Amino acid sequence: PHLLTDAVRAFQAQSPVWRPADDEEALRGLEAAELTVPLDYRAPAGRTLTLGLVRHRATAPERRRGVLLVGPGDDLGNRGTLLGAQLVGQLPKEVLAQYDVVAFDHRFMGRSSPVVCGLEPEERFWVFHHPRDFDHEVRFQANVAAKVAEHALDILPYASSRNIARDIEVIRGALGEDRISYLGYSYGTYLGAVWTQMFGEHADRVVLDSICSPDWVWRGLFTDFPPNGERALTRWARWAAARDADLGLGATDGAVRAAYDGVLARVDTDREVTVAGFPLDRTLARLIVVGMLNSDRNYPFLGDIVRSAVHGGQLEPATMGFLGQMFGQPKEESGTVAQLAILAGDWAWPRNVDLYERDMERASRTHPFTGAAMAGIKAPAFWPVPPSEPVTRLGPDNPADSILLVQAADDMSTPLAAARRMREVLGDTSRLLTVADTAHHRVFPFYGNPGADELVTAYLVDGELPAADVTRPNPAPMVPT
């Protein structure tokens, strides 16, 4: 493995020009700048691309202690600049007082040299796509790969987590900082592990929240999901079953689940299903629910949605705005393309299609909610380029001074087992905070858990870390322990 420090250093001498972020409503309130990075760090004098940065300066200059870099997006496919705006609105005031918060879109999406390939709306849901039948899905996923191959072949070798880690080093140098702090979620926690593994002597304080397993790269991210999807759905069903009076879905978790399964039975046989006046298909009937289950505070929304698919017409106004937020528009395309490129650019997927059919059929039986969608054939199996570098070896020689891991005990897409594995791999420099009785993605600061907020703030502000892993309770749990 090679760091390519010479090429990184070559681009660290930049001094970006910051101005108000005036060209996008969600970013008003922030400054914006552009940076150049090489496409290929083995070819520093070759082709380059531009990254879009945003910043919110420390509100108390006399107390400023450094830069807090936000990992470039939570779930892979999402924009880091938009995450930074969200965080500026919800981080503790004292964190905002002492840190310049800097965020960025990683290479190939958003404000950072976006790549689009003509993907149709259905194609942008390739990750959670539920198959008609296996032969149809082979063709569906192969054709997704075909579009990216045709329109982006020349940059696909350079879509990797290690290159984003080098990009982070360029940002750090450009900001003029010897050390930076880091806050990351989901894919941002894999990037945080990689960047600290490669360059962690330059880390100050590091918080990773809702943790990618180090074992996942990258098909395990998919094949570990269905059991956690089933568990999260069942937890909601228990919550719904205690509320039959107000929801009308059933008085046992089995009955609520059968109500929902009846909606799946319908889309899985091209029988019409609508939520308000908006049609569901095999994928959306499951993905709308996955989207809700990313936070157990959405349980009421999900009751309204399932009720509206079974009987009703209208949804409650609140639910309509939240669903319109989340779906309403097509999934942002360049993020879909970058998500494909990274998942296949980091690591070579199996290419034998019989493996996927076997796995799809087994997972459809053991975990029906999302088994077939997660374990079956996916576009990286047909990818036109191999990885340019081996996967980073994460391990207890990680040079970061300290890493705090934050994890909701019942989170779905990044489960507690994944955080525990990351803790084992990173070794004694890391500590794990588990938040009990909480099925939520991105705990600090978004959930408002007093215990997590207090412990993370004490680390970021004062450098306090517990002596060993700790648990904190949820004082307002959606269901009993």
Ligand X SMILES: COC(=O)/C=C(\C)[C@@]12O[C@]13c1cc(O)c4c(c1N[C@H]2C#C/C=C\C#C[C@H]3O)C(=O)c1ccccc1C4=O
Residues of this chain that interact with ligand X (CB under 6 A) are 75-77, 125, 127-128, 186-187, 190, 212, 221-222, 225, 287, 290-291, 294, 326, 331, 339, 413-414
Residue 291 C-beta: closest distance to ligand X, Å = 3
Count of positions (residues) in the chain = 481
CB of 354 to ligand X, least distance (A): 22
Q: Which candidate, 356, 338, 384, places its Cα nearest to that of 223?
A: 356
Structure tokens belonging to residue 252: 């046992």
Instruction: Give least dist CB 229 to ligand X, A.
Output: 9
Q: Which is nearer to ligand X, 41 or 222 (CB)?
A: 222
CB of 387 to ligand X, least distance (A): 15
CB of 11 to ligand X, least distance (A): 26
* Smallest separation, CB 302 to ligand X (Å): 12
- Structure-token pair, residue 242: 């205690």
Of 100 and 346, which has the nearer Cβ to ligand X? 346
| Distance between CA atoms of residues 184 and 80, nearest Å | 10
Provide, rounded to whole angstroms, the least separation between the CB of residue 326 and ligand X: 6
Burial of 298 (0-12, 13-18, 19+ CB in 10 A): buried
Q: Using DSSP, state whether 219 is helix, strand or coil.
A: helix
Rounded to 5°, angle at Cα 71 from 186 and 88: 105
Contacts for 90-94 with beta carbons within 8 Å, 24 or more apart?
Answer: 90/445, 90/446, 91/445, 92/445, 92/453, 92/457, 93/59, 94/457, 94/461
Least distance CB 301 / ligand X (angstroms): 13
At which residue do the structure tokens 């020689």 appear?
A: 397
Specify the residue, 76 or 267, whose C-beta has the smaller distance to ligand X: 76
Q: Which is nearer to ligand X, 72 or 250 (CB)?
A: 72
Closer CB to ligand X, 364 or 413, in the complex: 413
Rank residues 106 and 202 by Cβ distance to ligand X and give the closer one: 106
Nearer to ligand X, 77 or 380 (CB): 77
* β-bridge pairing 66-70 and 48-56: unpaired
Residues 6+ apart with CB under 8 A from 320: 276, 314
28 by Cβ neighbours in 10 Å (0-12 / 13-18 / 19+) ranks as exposed
Nearer to ligand X, 121 or 427 (CB): 121
Q: What is the C-alpha to C-alpha distance for residues 113 and 179, in angstroms, rounded to an integer?
A: 27
